[PDB]
Design a protein around this ligand. Structure first.
Ligand SMILES: [Zn+2]
Ligand SMILES: [Zn+2]
Ligand SMILES: [Zn+2]
Lengths: 357, 354
């Protein structure tokens, strides 16, 4: 691994997400449909039994699992639950009928997640599927099925392309399951259409990078931050805050935007930066109401908003205008500006963004 | 008005023994839970249940998330808990024979009522409201309803609302376990715990001046971290919510097994870390998480069972709790955290009363 033109490996890994996602899609999209034949000819038999999906993960992989739950329920109609592995492995849980256990890990050796999989064997799940970046790892070996993310090696201190490539795999599995259930073929068609557009969409907003870098300067004297999102963007806010905290040591936390009135609002003042992801969807007007709560309360707003969402930059509201994006890939797309934000704030504070050597 | 008490919040904390006893009134008979007030159609409905969906926000959400551990562990019933503002606007997968439970103090919370109304549209099996206000919209519009009998709260925050909601939820866990034919020892142990809970809280209140003294450590603090595992994780969440709501400290809660993604690097000597440590199967795991914090220099306030085996040191301050029946431990361990938040608020000069 050489940095090329990039100044840091984390920078390289964020900017290379278009190529990373195309690597994730290779051989898995054929004639406008999802092709998961790598799973073998025994997969469909199992997968079409599935009536429930249990996801186990931690950290950034838990956040990606949380996004996919919205997809599985809304697009594939399959009940889905996501749990932190360290809590699942020690608690007596209820049996869901015909449940598929999905594990998300980048290394495939994450102890609590692997411990959770080794417990699922004894509780009678239908089967297990590992979504992982390392072939031959324990989670892959010990799972019934496995789908590699093809993200390559990360040298940044936190995962960037590893998160978006997991989401990409999860979204392909949504499309495959939607077909296995006999749902309308248009669902798979629209998912595949969005995934095919996502690399170019990410390339489009990377042009906004130096805007994010300048706005990051506002974080120079701060050590708190608040991230807001709604719907399938709430886990993107959670991931944004995790990134900022892991890489910059800012006390960053995330809330579902419709819940500000339970604590956060009282602490919001002129010294609190509030970061919001605002796609142009059915939740936008409600989100604007939540954004106004923060604005009228003095918060310093940094809003990553679709370019036709109608926001106006004022003194305490800074708008980063995002290109249009297909709604099904919007959570993957809106993660990228938050990665850039954490990267730039980390460097401003003088913190390392790359692993030693 | 306050009687012997200083602030309404102090009164409401010190009275939760009474409050819990009021919540149990008429609902324990011959060692079993008696929810015949639900009406004669309740048992068919509840006997059908294969899944429980809980909708709430705020404090009632945290109570819902405690109950999820009970419904799954003790009744064997899959349970999901969701913030109402998120549920009402997403296209969700309806589980078979799903029971919608709403939790609300007022019975009028808009998003929660919207979620109930959507559940009818989506073909849920039925609905049950847990609430403190008879005749409210959530009560009238649900198939079944159980009042908490908590009374009125004047404190800026919710003290007896949370513990009395939990008490109702646990009685419902017991009822469901009998309906489903699970071992009668589950209901017996729940009933035994609930009967002992007011006395246990009274025993704990003797620690109030220890807690008051330790709260002086927070006078110059603006951050705090709350840790819990298992069914105490939502107790940590509620404790952090309290401290933030009434003391304006930036308080956060984490599952203690997850220090590894963020919290541990932010922990220093100026970071107070509050932990609830019941004597159960997770205790040895929790102690290792505590040791990770201690090694980071974090300064620990551990509310711990007297039989847990904790020794106070310079950086570890133990508040000894009585022995607590495990089924009511989440209810029990909330109260010292309420007292902590109360005393920190007073030391900060905040009002604790509306
Ligand atoms: Zn982890
Ligand atoms: Zn609310
Ligand atoms: Zn601070």
């Amino acid at each position: 691994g050489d940095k090329g033109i990039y100044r840091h490996y984390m920078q390289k890994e964020i900017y290379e997400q278009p190529n990373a996602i195309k690597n994730t899609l290779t051989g898995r999209i054929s004639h406008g449909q999802v092709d998961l034949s790598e799973l073998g000819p025994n997969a469909d038999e199992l997968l079409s039994k599935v009536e429930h999906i249990q996801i186990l993960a931690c950290g950034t992989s838990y956040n990606s699992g949380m996004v996919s739950r919205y997809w599985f329920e809304s697009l594939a109609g399959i009940p889905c639950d996501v749990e932190i592995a360290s809590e699942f492995r020690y608690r007596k849980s209820a049996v869901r009928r015909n449940s598929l256990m999905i594990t998300l890990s980048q290394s495939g050796e994450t102890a609590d997640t692997l411990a959770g999989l080794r417990l699922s064997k004894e509780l009678g799940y239908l089967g297990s599927l590992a979504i992982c970046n390392v072939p031959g790892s324990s989670l892959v070996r010990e799972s019934d099925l496995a789908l590699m993310t093809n993200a390559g090696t990360e040298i940044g201190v936190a995962s960037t392309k590893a998160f978006t490539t997991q989401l990409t795999v999860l979204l392909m599995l949504v499309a495959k399951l939607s077909r296995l259930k006999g749902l309308d073929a248009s669902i798979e068609h629209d998912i595949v259409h969005g995934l095919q557009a996502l690399p170019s969409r990410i390339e489009q907003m990377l042009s906004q990078d130096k805007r994010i870098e300048a706005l990051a300067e506002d974080f120079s004297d701060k050590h708190h931050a608040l991230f807001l999102g709604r719907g399938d963007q709430y886990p993107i806010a959670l991931e944004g805050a995790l990134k900022l905290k892991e890489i910059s040591y800012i006390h960053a936390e995330a809330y579902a935007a419709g819940e500000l009135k339970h604590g956060p609002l009282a602490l919001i003042d002129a010294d609190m930066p509030v970061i919001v992801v605002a796609p142009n969807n059915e939740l936008l007007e409600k989100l604007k109401s939540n954004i106004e709560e923060v604005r009228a309360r003095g918060g310093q707003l940094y809003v990553f908003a679709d370019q036709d969402a109608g926001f106006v930059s004022s003194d305490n509201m800074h708008i980063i205008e995002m290109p249009h994006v297909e709604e099904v890939i919007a959570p993957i797309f809106y993660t990228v500006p938050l990665q850039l934000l954490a990267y730039h704030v980390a460097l401003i504070k003088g913190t390392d963004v790359d692993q030693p050597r």
